[PDB]
């Protein structure tokens, strides 16, 4: 049987699977380095898998849509932590300290009337 | 530049141009329309363009075919 976990980050929905086989990274029928992840947010996908005994532990298939570079990257970060239901509620207690299970409630602010974008009040003449 | 294919003019003013050729030129005609363009047949014919007060005597010349009638009557008076 498969092991599922959702996660998302700023309107970027992801779908993580974990299986016991080889350590190859398949994302949207493409490799990890061939998913252009060279600069910042290079290893934020493997951020929840930092403090574990790994060597070459798991298969993974991940597919993310919506947002941009870091929006899709941070969706995989939170998506894998929900996909740890193979290891169930044991290893999450240590992962509570890191705060990767925390779904970030920060979303882009709506544009407001009489403001340039959400906060910036346009300037005025002297006093 | 503008008007795409074919030089757009007014109908009523074309009859005045044909009047100046067939019946012959007499005096400068007082025309309110600035929309029409100058042609080769309009060369050597006196015309007059309205511009918010009274018709200005604009003399037509060989090289004026490239521009409109409205350019030769300045609307806004200065100084």
């Amino acid at each position: 049987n498969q092991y599922y976990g959702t996660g998302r980050r700023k309107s970027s929905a992801a779908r993580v699977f974990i299986k016991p086989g080889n350590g190859k990274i398949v994302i949207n029928q493409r490799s990890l380095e061939q998913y252009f992840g060279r600069e910042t947010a290079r290893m934020v996908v493997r951020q929840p898998l930092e403090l574990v005994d790994m060597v070459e532990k798991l298969d993974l298939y991940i597919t993310v849509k919506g947002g941009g570079i870091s929006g899709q990257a941070g969706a995989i970060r939170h998506g894998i932590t929900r996909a740890l239901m193979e290891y169930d509620e044991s290893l999450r207690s240590e992962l509570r300290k890191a705060g990767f299970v925390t779904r970030d409630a920060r979303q882009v602010e709506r544009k407001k009337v009489g403001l340039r974008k959400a906060r910036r009040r346009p300037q005025f003449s002297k006093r | 530049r503008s008007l795409k294919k074919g030089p757009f003019i007014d109908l009523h003013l074309l009859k005045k141009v044909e009047k100046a050729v067939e019946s012959g030129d007499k005096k400068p005609l007082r025309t309110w329309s600035r929309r029409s363009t100058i042609f080769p047949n309009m060369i050597g014919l006196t015309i007059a363009v309205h511009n918010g007060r009274q018709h200005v005597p604009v003399f037509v010349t060989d090289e004026m075919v490239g521009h409109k009638l409205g350019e030769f009557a300045p609307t806004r008076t200065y100084r």
């Binding site: 709506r110 | 074919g6 757009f8 109908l11 009523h12 074309l14």
Partner: protein, 96 residues
């Protein structure tokens, strides 16, 4: 809002079906790169107030020529007066 301008508007709108719409098929297909004769362009001595995009599109109640929405068919001031009295279905205070 000056009922003579609305009388001028009712005239302007009522000429759209007669002079143009039906007989405005001329200049669309006829004036094109075909086969020229300039006699088709000499049919523009028509009254001109029939023109398809001439109207300001005034508000139907008052006759204000500003803030006219195509959806409601009313000016911005009459939108608030109407909307707060209901009348437009499924309309309420927008907040998201």
């Amino acid at each position: 809002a000056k009922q003579s301008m609305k009388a001028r508007e009712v005239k302007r709108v009522a000429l759209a079906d007669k002079y143009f719409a039906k007989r405005a098929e001329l200049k669309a297909i006829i004036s094109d790169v075909n086969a020229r004769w300039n006699a088709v362009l000499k049919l523009q001595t028509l009254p001109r107030d029939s023109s398809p995009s001439r109207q300001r599109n005034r508000c139907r109640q008052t006759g204000r020529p500003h803030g006219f929405l195509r959806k409601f068919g009313l000016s911005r001031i009459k939108v608030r007066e109407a909307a707060m009295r209901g009348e437009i279905p499924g309309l309420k205070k927008a907040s998201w």
